[PDB]
Amino acid sequence: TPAFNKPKVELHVHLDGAIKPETILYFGKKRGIALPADTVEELRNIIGMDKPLSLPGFLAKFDYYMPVIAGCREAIKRIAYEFVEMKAKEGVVYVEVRYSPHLLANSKVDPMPWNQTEGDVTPDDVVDLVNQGLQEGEQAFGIKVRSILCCMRHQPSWSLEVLELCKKYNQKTVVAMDLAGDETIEGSSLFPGHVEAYEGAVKNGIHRTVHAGQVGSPEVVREAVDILKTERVGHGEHTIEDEALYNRLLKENMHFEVCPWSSYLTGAWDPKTTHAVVRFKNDKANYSLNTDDPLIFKSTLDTDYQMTKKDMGFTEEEFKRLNINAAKSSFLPEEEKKELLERLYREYQ
Ligand X SMILES: O=c1[nH]cnc2c([C@@H]3O[C@H](CO)[C@@H](O)[C@H]3O)c[nH]c12
* Site residues (vs Zn ion, CB under 5 A): 292
Q: Report the residue number, 16 or 292, with the smaller CB distance to Zn ion.
A: 292
Q: Which of 9, 84, 103, 301 binds ligand X (CB under 6 A)?
A: 103
Name which position in 83, 99, 158, 280 contacts ligand X (CB under 6 A): 99
CB nearer to ligand X: give 28 or 294: 294
Please give the C-alpha separations between residue 9 and each of 168, 198, 214, 292, in angstroms, as whole numbers: 25, 25, 21, 13
Among 4, 8, 11, 16, binds ligand X (CB under 6 A): 16
Quick check: 53 and 266 in contact, CB under 8 A?
yes
Residues composing the chain:
349
Per DSSP, the residues of 209-232 read EEEESSSS-HHHHHHHHHTS--SE
- Of positions 4, 62, 64, 65, contacts ligand X by CB under 6 A: 62
| Segment 295 to 334, residues that bind ligand X, using CB under 6 A | none
Stretch that binds ligand X, among 87-95, 98-106, 218-226, 303-311 (CB under 6 A): 98-106
Residue 291 in the binding site for ligand X (CB under 6 A): no
Q: Could you tell which of Zn ion, ligand X, none binds residue 100, using a CB distance below 5 to 8 A set by kind? A: ligand X
Residue with Cβ nearer Zn ion (97 or 240):
97
131 binds, among Zn ion, ligand X, none (CB under 5 to 8 A by kind): none
Provide the CA 281 distance to its chain's centre, in angstroms.
21
Q: Is the peptide bond before 111 cis (omega within 30 degrees of 0)?
A: yes
Please report whether residue 266 would count as binding ligand X according to CB under 6 A: yes
d(CA 257, CA 235): 5
In this structure, what are the phi and psi dihedrals at residue 256, rounded to the nearest 5 degrees? Answer: -110, 130
CB 207 within 8 A of CB 201: yes
Please answer whether residues 236 and 184 qualify as being in contact, where contact means their C-beta atoms are separated by less than 8 angstroms. Answer: no
Burial of 137 (0-12, 13-18, 19+ CB in 10 A): buried
Residue 59 interacting with ligand X (CB under 6 A): yes
The least CB distance from residue 15 to Zn ion, in Å, is: 11
Cβ pair 12, 259 in contact under 8 A? yes
Scanning 95-103, 241-249, 274-282, 313-321 for contacts with ligand X by CB under 6 A, the matching segment is 95-103
x/- map, 214-233, ligand X, by CB under 6 A: x-------------------
Closest to ligand X by CB, 150 or 307: 150
DSSP state of 155: -
- Which residues are bridge partners to 98 per DSSP? 14, 148
140 SS3 class:
helix
Q: Which is nearer to ligand X, 37 or 97 (CB)?
A: 97
Pattern 176-215, ligand X, x by CB under 6 A = ----xx-----------------------------x--x-
Residues 6+ apart with CB under 8 A from 117: 106
For the CB of residue 169, give the shortest distance to ligand X in the complex, in Å.
16
Query: Cα 194 to chain center, whole Å?
Result: 18
Q: Does residue number 237 form part of the binding site for ligand X (CB under 6 A)?
A: no
Which residues make up the interface to ligand X (CB under 6 A)?
14, 16-17, 59, 62, 98-100, 103, 150, 180-181, 211, 214, 262, 266, 292-293
